[PDB]
Amino acid sequence: TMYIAFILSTIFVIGFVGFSSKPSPIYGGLGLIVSGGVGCGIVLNFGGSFLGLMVFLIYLGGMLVVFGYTTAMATEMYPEVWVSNKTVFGAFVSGLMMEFCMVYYALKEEEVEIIFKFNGLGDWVIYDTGDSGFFSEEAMGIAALYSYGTWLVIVTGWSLLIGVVVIMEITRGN
Amino acid sequence: LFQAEKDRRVLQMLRENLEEEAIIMKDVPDWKVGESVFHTTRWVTPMMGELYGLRTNEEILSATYGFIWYT
Amino acid sequence: MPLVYMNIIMAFAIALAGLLMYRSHLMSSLLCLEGMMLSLFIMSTLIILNTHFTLANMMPIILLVFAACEAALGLSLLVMVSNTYGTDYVQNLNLLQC
Amino acid sequence: MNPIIYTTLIMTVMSGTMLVMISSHWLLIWIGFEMNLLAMIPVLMKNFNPRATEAATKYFLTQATASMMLMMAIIINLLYSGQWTITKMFNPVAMTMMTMALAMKLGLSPFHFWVPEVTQGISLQAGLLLLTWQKLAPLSVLCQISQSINPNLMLTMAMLSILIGGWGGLNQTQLRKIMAYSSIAHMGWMTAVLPYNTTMTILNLLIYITMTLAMFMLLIHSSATTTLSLSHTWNKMPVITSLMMVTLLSMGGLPPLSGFMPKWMIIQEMTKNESIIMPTLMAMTALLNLYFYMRLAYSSSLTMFPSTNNMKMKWQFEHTKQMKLLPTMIVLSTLVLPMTPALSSLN
Amino acid sequence: TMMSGRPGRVPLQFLPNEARSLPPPKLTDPRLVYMGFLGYCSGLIDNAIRRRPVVSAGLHRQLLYVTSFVFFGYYLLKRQDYMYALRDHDMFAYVKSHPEDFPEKDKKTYGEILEEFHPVR
Amino acid sequence: PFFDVQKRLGLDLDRWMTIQSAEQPHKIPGRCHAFEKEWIECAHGIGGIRAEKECKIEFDDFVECLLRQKTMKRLSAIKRQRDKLIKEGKYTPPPHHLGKEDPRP
Amino acid sequence: AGRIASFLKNAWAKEPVLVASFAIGGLAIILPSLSPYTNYAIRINRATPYNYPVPLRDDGNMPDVPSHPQDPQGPSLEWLKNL
Amino acid sequence: PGIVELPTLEDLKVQEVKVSSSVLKAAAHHYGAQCDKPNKEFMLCRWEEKDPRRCLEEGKLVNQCALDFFRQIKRHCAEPFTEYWTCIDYSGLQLFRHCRKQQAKFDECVLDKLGWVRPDLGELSKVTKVKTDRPLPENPYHSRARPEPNPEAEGDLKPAKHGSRLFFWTM
Amino acid sequence: MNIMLTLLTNVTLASLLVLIAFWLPQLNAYSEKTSPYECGFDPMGSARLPFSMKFFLVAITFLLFDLEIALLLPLPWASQTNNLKTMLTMALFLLILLAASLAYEWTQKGLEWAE
Ligand SMILES: CCCCCCCCCCCCCCCCCC(=O)OC[C@H](COP(=O)([O-])OCC[N+](C)(C)C)OC(=O)CCCCCCCCCCCCCCCCC
Ligand SMILES: CCCCCCCCCCCCCCCCC[C@@H](O)O[C@H](CO[C@H](O)CCCCCCCCCCCCCCC)COP(=O)(O)OCC[N+](C)(C)C
Ligand SMILES: CCCCCCCCCCCCCCCCCC(=O)OC[C@H](COP(=O)(O)OCCN)OC(=O)CCCCCCCCCCCCCCCCC
């Protein structure tokens, strides 16, 4: 078992609690980067190496722009950190306490939330016995974006081109 | 050849799990050993919990993560 | 359902509650918006990889693409607001009233 | 904005809505919503000023939140069924998330504040496109998934929409905010009938779109954005004020005008399903909308307000641009009550 | 959606092939005349908005308005009649197929039916 | 609302991706391909109402294959009973379950 | 034609990078439709046995299906062998 | 619902093929050429029955053919085969490209001692046909009777009686 | 497992180096030594004041193009498909749309830094 997926999921939730308590965009980006790396680990354990590395790389690139933007647009004299503010620390502690409570309840008994029913057992239990051979199912399914999914490529490329046009138009001014 | 070996190994582990379940759940009031959770009588591929359930953590880990962690 | 799905859904709920509760900066809310799509990506790929839905493996990539388009749109609006008002504070977006 | 870029952005908005309407896959529906929003932001920001920037920011924030909630609902539905097709949703929690997201997109209460704020922020053409097309898409999705809609949630949001629209419109004195609150009330009516007859939903959508197009184009023709600005139009072109007064009477639901047909059909259809309290409350609450339409009609056509001295030069000059299909919208929004049984063709 | 998804429905078809067996509307239909009247009203409103003589100017334009409205009204009436015929057909077939749900009841005369009398005084 | 242009024009834009029992690259089967096929075949052509009333057994099997809730309940019950029996020393695991056996190749 | 030559000579003197980029892209778009080896690439991809070749149940009316791998019937990769 | 049926441990017993992956990969083309028929019968059974419990005897026959093939090799070409699979076992990926001399010696030995011809490129991947006496499964999915379809439309269309019947409209 | 052990080893070695650096030498700290550096004179303002970014548009375009390359990365596996013509068409379509985005921004002066 080793509970590696559960530990990683808990760290994922912790990073979300951080950047959602919202200290300041520098530390929000730091927490989001931690969460992206940990999610890469979770999906690597579940099987998708390409998907994990891709989401990690995309969020590393995206948060690089956010740093430059918060240096220019979203900075103040004394940037707030988690312990610097009463509201930020309160929200951070609330999120951590909620995560701890739900984790403890799930481990102690099969916890049914007011939304969904969860069973405390093995993420290794839920896996499938069967195997593939001499190819990666994830890689083949992703590579099927060009043979299958011609429509998806068309709409995605159109959206990206129009996105360039839009960002040029919004920031025109005048 | 590996297909035949796989079928024999899976069925053997299932039979052993069934025997251990019969030994364990002998005093449970409403419990039928070997009862399927599916309405259909068609053969259903076991999940890793059904095969490596009553086994050591070493075997469980090898079966569930050995390939992914092998680098 | 495993506890992993519970944690991912909890992360999405936390990121949604973060977005809906502004403090001062628009950038922090944008970061909360980017976290929600990260949790959506992780949840979708966990569901797809477990079920061996081979042709659905491309869906998280499209999800990421449109997350990027949303982030670009939000950053463009943020630079326009900052040019107008000197700060990215959401208190300045009060000219229009209900 | 370059005319070519503007028309390609309009076409992209329309393409996103059409993708939403023709897709059978939840991912493609989400893609259509995203494409619509992305191309719709610059249209709002077409005339650059702080109000337009603020309106575009608020619209983007609301629509991004709604799209995120919609994708969460889609993924939750996939978890419990493994189905990507848009049909009855297999999870009540996913259905509740989907209903909340689509209501936030449409502006149903309590998700309505962005509607008056953004509409006042953006120009008349942008508000026309916003109301019409951006109501056109989510309602098609709701009609597709109607058989799993929670009647209690849908009807609660519909009655809230009707009440809020009436009251806000009562207070407002700006024409664009009046139009926005009227839009909220009409969306309330449509979604109230939604869990019983999607055909009646479509009929109300078409009549509302016609009346809104006529009203917005009359405002654009008269170049009036406030009550007092519209009070000068009787001294320039008294025909436009009369047409606007008849259109306002139609929008208020007075017989025998075309605005009575949707309310009539919806009341009848809900009564068939043994609903009486809800149709009676809905019918009585529309008197608020009629009151502020009549308040607007007093200022512009039924009374003659003071004018200014440069109106003489305005008399000397003539209106150049011609509105496309304005006479047709005026006629369709007032005189098609005897053509009611064509809703079977609409079926 | 009552009749959406009815078996044998071709998508995006304004008028199916099975609608050809119904009587087409007469060209002097009062509904067609009302559609022409709507076209004429649109033409007059066009002249009024553009500040031309309302009844005199743009006779060709007014003719085009009336003709377009009559054309579209003719096709709309055909589709409406087809949908109503389809509804009646389905209803009759269902009643025929479910006799236990739509039973014929024995008719009793008013000499046999007893009704309470409520005097007005 | 729904304009079935795909059905009208004979196109295939996303119906390939709608289900996991459809054509997959290299004929890779889904985890619940048989259950989904059975449910789809049962529910074909009878509409949503009758499909929900009558194919409930097939749908229940499909959801069981998807989520594995009854199986996890059984596994957890067996684990709890085994742990309780081991706590009081009433149960002894066999060597092939303790790791003192030679499995098949 | 003279205008085309003048434009190309000006671009080659001002933007050789862009001239090379467009030439390479244009060749990449056009050449595959003229190459006789595209079908060979498709055939080589089809000839790769990723999964098991499940045999057919013999009905006695399958003269083109081999009974053994080494029988003459069945696809041949002799074309790929000498390629 | 019901109780699953599992074969006992007595009838799951068989003589195992206790060679390693390198040994199997060395004698893989000759094995596929020689023991083709039992393996094809077993694979057809597995794909038609969709049930491990219904093709145990075919698995026993597969193991028996493998053991007979390896005994036949061991009786005649033990030394070249040992050299060949020793060469294969060194490679981390178990590549055929690095052991062409030993493969040549082994192929020469089995061609003379046993008359074996190694399959050419693209032959073991061919889809063949199998003659079996076991009947074709009628219901391999254990399906149920499908729900009866709704009755189709019948008759010719007549105009709606008394028109729309929508309130006061006479048409 | 091995990768986790490797990451742990690298992080532990770096942290030990930091610990040795901050604890081995003799330390003497006072307010003048630890003051911020600005070439011998005191800083007029604060280093936390807003710092204008003249390439704000190139950053957004970088986000979009980064996800374009994310789309392009699975091409090596896409070359093993039987639908080579469709794969090649869609790959060239994506690359041509990327080139079109670059050309549009370049001609509309999006690549020029603000003045
Ligand atoms: C190359 C990368 C890794 C580098 C690792 C370390 C490299 C250097 C190894 C040799 C270091 C020798 C000792 C230097 C200590 C600093 C000198 C100093 O501060 O002197 C002034 C001070 C003077 O003290 P004082 O008491 O006279 O002064 C009082 C203060 N004032 C100046 C104001 C009057 O020296 C000391 O305090 C002496 C402390 C003990 C010195 C020996 C202890 C360290 C032994 C190191 C052995 C190696 C293993 C452990 C080290 C880590 C490496 C694994
Ligand atoms: C030049 C002559 C004049 C032309 C003027 C043209 C103006 C109108 C443009 C034509 C509009 C209709 C398009 C006709 C071709 C499209 C065919 C298709 O769209 O028709 C059917 C659908 O068409 C429309 O739905 C109905 C057309 C009729 C609408 C106009 C009348 C609305 C009623 C208003 C009554 C009171 C006003 C009376 C008119 C003045 C297809 O059914 P289906 O694909 O499966 O729908 C799926 C979605 N559903 C099931 C939920 C509905
Ligand atoms: C299929 C598309 C239908 C809509 C097309 C609308 C195009 C015109 C839009 C502008 C507003 C109306 C026209 C007002 C006059 C404009 C200036 C002028 O002098 O126009 C002259 C023009 C002459 O007509 P002409 O262009 O030759 O006809 C088409 C030839 N191929 O004069 C005219 O064209 C006048 C008559 C216009 C047609 C009547 C109005 C629409 C009728 C619709 C019938 C269906 C009813 C429901 C409509 C719902 C909304 C579309």
mmCIF file of C-alpha atoms in Angstrom, chain B residues 21 24-35, chain F residues 73-74 77-78 80-81, chain H residues 1 3:
data_model
loop_
_atom_site.group_PDB
_atom_site.id
_atom_site.type_symbol
_atom_site.label_atom_id
_atom_site.label_comp_id
_atom_site.label_asym_id
_atom_site.label_seq_id
_atom_site.Cartn_x
_atom_site.Cartn_y
_atom_site.Cartn_z
ATOM 1 C CA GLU B 21 -12.716 -16.465 3.288
ATOM 2 C CA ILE B 24 -12.590 -16.583 8.332
ATOM 3 C CA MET B 25 -16.232 -15.627 7.700
ATOM 4 C CA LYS B 26 -17.604 -18.784 9.303
ATOM 5 C CA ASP B 27 -19.316 -17.138 12.295
ATOM 6 C CA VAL B 28 -20.685 -14.089 10.453
ATOM 7 C CA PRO B 29 -24.502 -14.405 10.671
ATOM 8 C CA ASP B 30 -25.563 -13.286 7.174
ATOM 9 C CA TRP B 31 -22.593 -14.086 4.939
ATOM 10 C CA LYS B 32 -22.390 -16.457 1.968
ATOM 11 C CA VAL B 33 -18.836 -17.260 0.916
ATOM 12 C CA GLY B 34 -18.057 -16.730 -2.758
ATOM 13 C CA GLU B 35 -21.093 -14.556 -3.471
ATOM 14 C CA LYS F 73 -17.402 -3.242 0.940
ATOM 15 C CA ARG F 74 -16.875 -7.013 0.821
ATOM 16 C CA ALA F 77 -15.631 -6.572 5.755
ATOM 17 C CA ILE F 78 -13.320 -9.546 5.196
ATOM 18 C CA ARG F 80 -12.015 -6.309 9.429
ATOM 19 C CA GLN F 81 -13.119 -9.816 10.385
ATOM 20 C CA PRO H 1 -26.647 -12.740 -5.943
ATOM 21 C CA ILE H 3 -21.950 -17.987 -5.889
#
